[PDB]
Amino acid sequence: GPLGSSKVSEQLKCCSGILKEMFAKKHAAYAWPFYKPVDVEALGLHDYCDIIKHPMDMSTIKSKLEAREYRDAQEFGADVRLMFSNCYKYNPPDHEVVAMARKLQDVFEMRFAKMP
């Protein structure tokens, strides 16, 4: 049968829809800690860069996706998961922000599991 050529382009369209959902006001009560880079110095989190090698957040992910800086859905998903796994490394497991991260990550992973 005929060959195709647009797997990558449909993957990234799917990714923008997932990010749009993640940014939706419906999730704001638990998504807000992930909107913007952790302001390490302003917040006095002097140990953050001792624990976290590569900070990531959804505004940065949005900027990268809209600047075409992801090759495919795998690269987009890796940054999303990096931002969550940073949260889990830095904060205690019973911290309020970890519960918020796990809830938002359910939103992401549910949709990321689906075929585009």
Binding site: W32, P33, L43, G44
Partner: peptide
Amino acid sequence: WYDVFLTRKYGKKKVAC
């Protein structure tokens, strides 16, 4: 949002909202 006063005061995240 973060309670910045308290986040700085204890060097761990404190949620304000």
